């Protein structure tokens, strides 16, 4: 568990952060796949967070390991981890040509079937109108053909990494997915099922019926993308490249960087609605060009095809989280030459997007200097009218938790540093004043909520409420004086204390560089939070960082009601009956054999919440990126 650091005060960034890496890639540490070298979403398997299991993992974590791989190539001048991260990646989580069959069969002009979401999980499945509703046009597909053949080159959002539902073959990685039936289906709430639908398991149509409802059902594959995910691969790997030249040692990375410059280019596809409405239309209105481009990373996009059957469809998403955003991905992809699309109009599509994220962040600035949630172009899912004395960007809607309600997508303050963090690489970067008044407010803002206690302690926003709305965007900040945030409670999550501190030093750099005076207390800041982090929380196993997290949350594991329609009867791949009536807790009966299924389960049944010790992933590195980012511009 969590115990004082046994480190030598005034150890520097750099021997920390090495120290880090190597108890994280430690194999006998657990935190990657033995076959695979997958890096799992934590090294304990009963978790229940975005993913549902401890050894299903994200795309985020492979991007996540290219960051960890990239900053240790900069500190110790060592480019083979970023070279084997990407290869992890390219191997397991991008779908290759055998997994993408027919996508050269899309059409552009007939993209998708237009289907509602709808406000709860029971609504579902949804209706697919075939002939009901036309559909916009795809206006980058081909664009984007002509420079890479038929194949998307983007990662997959959740793979099962040895196996455990038993969808695939012996303990080999397997995509899935569990999230489908909308804004209320918690994690809790959702039926997992095979990316690669041949029906096997489920019921007769395989799970295909639970979530849209059709007069008939083809074996089909599909997958989902995270842009965030990709978004800082390609971050990291301008990085890995800056570094990696500074030392003479670019060609290390120069194939990667190649295929970094392509994920991106393929990113334009988030760029989209959902169904290529025209933006703005407050209605089932089809576009065609880039007339339903928002031109920002909404939550995904989404394509599939035929297994058996020559066919295939492609959707965007009308919904944008500022949370997801990455706009000095954008300005690497828009403007740096190694990294620039080997399409025709990427560039151009990059420079319009990274401009474009940026005002977003703007507009949706708290008078307090948090920010808020996003927009969507699809009110309540299903192109309804925006509510009277609703605000917009670029015709879009504002709304306070895009994409999912339970919880709201942006009570999570984790959002605020992730995506700030960003912002302050773009300034860092650039020195671009556009954004002064944006971060400054910002940061401000957040180092008047971090607090830190004369015993060594520290606490940091964890949960956040919002009121109102901001401005209508005109194109320039109003100071939102009726948009407002609050934070309802703290904590001492490791990973957001990282990302945090990472930001904060980054900003720290930037002031030195751009600004004539170094914020030293930025840099302070940043420099308390690492400290902090490791030293209260220093794994006693030598694993690295840990928690230790009373879960309340976990009686869901034993109460929450999953829907299934009425008349709906199949299995899970062990046996498992999927049927009305389930818990979570029967279709994934393997969690009895978990080795802490005894300790949440005796917790609950005196009602009581279980406590848990985690070493997440992206903890891990969220904390050792930040004491590089710090060796790295404040070494000493
Ligand atoms: O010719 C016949 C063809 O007909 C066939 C029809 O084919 C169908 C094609 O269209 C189908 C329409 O389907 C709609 C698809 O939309 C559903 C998309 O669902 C998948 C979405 O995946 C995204 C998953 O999102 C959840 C991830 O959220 C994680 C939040 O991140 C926060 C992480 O931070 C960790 C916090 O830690 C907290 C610890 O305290």
């Known amino acids: 568990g969590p115990t004082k650091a046994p480190t030598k005060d005034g150890t520097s960034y750099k021997d920390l952060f090495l120290e880090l890496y190597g108890k994280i890639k430690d194999p006998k540490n657990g935190y990657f796949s033995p076959d695979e070298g997958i890096p799992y979403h934590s090294i304990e398997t009963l978790i ?119 969808f695939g073959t012996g303990t080999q990685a397997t995509f899935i997915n569990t999230f489908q039936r909308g804004e209320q289906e918690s994690t809790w709430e959702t039926i997992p099922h095979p990316s690669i639908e041949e029906f096997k398991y489920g019921g007769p149509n395989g799970f295909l019926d639970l979530f849209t409802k059709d007069r008939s059902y083809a074996r089909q594959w599909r997958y989902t993308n995270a842009p965030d995910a990709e978004g800082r691969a390609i971050q990291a790997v301008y990085w890995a490249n800056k570094w990696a030249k500074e030392q003479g040692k670019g060609s290390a990375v120069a194939s990667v960087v190649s295929k970094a410059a392509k994920m991106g280019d393929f990113l334009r596809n988030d760029m989209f609605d959902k169904y290529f409405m025209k933006i703005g239309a407050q209605d089932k209105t089809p576009a065609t060009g880039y007339d339903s481009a928002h031109y920002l990373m909404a939550w995904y996009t989404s394509w599939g095809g035929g297994i058996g059957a020559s066919w295939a469809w492609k959707i965007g998403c009308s919904h944008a989280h500022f949370g997801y955003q990455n706009p000095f991905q954008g300005w690497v992809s828009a403007t740096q030459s ?130 109102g709305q901001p401005d209508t965007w005109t194109g320039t900040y109003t100071g939102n004086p009726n948009l407002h945030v609050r934070v309802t409670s703290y904590g001492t999550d490791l990973g957001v204390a990282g990302s945090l501190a990472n930001a904060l030093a980054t900003y720290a750099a930037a002031t030195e560089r751009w600004e004539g005076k170094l914020d030293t207390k930025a840099r302070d800041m940043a420099a308390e939070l690492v400290n902090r982090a490791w030293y209260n929380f220093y794994c006693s196993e030598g694993k690295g960082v840990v928690t230790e997290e009373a879960r309340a949350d976990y009686k869901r594991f034993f109460e929450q009601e999953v829907y299934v329609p009425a008349g709906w009867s199949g299995t899970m791949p062990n046996g498992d009956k999927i049927q009305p009536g389930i818990k979570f807790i029967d279709i994934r009966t393997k969690y009895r054999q978990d080795p802490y299924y005894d300790i949440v389960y005796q917790a609950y049944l005196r009602g009581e919440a279980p406590v848990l010790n985690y070493h997440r992933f992206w903890h891990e590195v969220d904390l050792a990126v930040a004491m590089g980012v710090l060796a790295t511009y404040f070494p000493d």
Not at 367 to 385: D, L, V
Not at 405 to 412: C, E, F, H, I, Y
Not at 434 to 456: A, F, P, Q, R, T
Request: charged share 20%; glycine share 8%.
């Open 48 to 166: 229940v967070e975005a993913p549902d299991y401890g050894h299903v993992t994200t795309s985020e974590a492979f991007s996540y390991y290219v960051w960890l791989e990239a900053m240790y190539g900069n500190l110790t001048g060592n480019w083979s981890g970023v070279e084997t991260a990407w290869k992890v990646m390219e191997d397991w989580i991008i779908p290759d040509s055998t997994e993408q069959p027919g996508m050269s069969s899309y059409n552009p002009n007939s993209p998708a079937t237009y289907a509602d979401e709808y406000e709860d999980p029971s609504y579902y499945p949804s209706e697919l109108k075939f002939d009901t509703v036309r559909v916009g046009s795809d206006p980058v597909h081909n664009d984007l053909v002509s420079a890479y053949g038929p194949n998307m080159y983007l990662m997959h959002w959740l793979m099962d990494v040895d196996n455990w539902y038993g």
């Open 338 to 467: 190694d990294f620039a699309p080997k399409s025709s109009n990427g560039k151009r599509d990059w420079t319009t997007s990274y401009k474009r994220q940026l005002e977003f962040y703007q507009w949706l600035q708290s008078a307090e200097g948090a920010i808020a949630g996003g927009a969507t172009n699809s009110w309540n899912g299903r192109y309804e009218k925006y509510p009277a004395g609703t605000s917009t960007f670029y015709g879009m809607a504002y709304v306070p938790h895009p994409v999912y309600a339970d919880p709201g997508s942006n009570q999570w303050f984790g959002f605020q540093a992730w995506s700030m963090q960003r912002v302050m690489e773009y300034y860092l970067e650039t020195g671009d004043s556009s954004v002064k008044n944006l971060i400054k407010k910002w940061v401000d803002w957040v180092m008047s909520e971090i607090k830190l206690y004369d015993d060594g302690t520290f606490a940091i926003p964890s949960d956040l409420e919002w009121s």
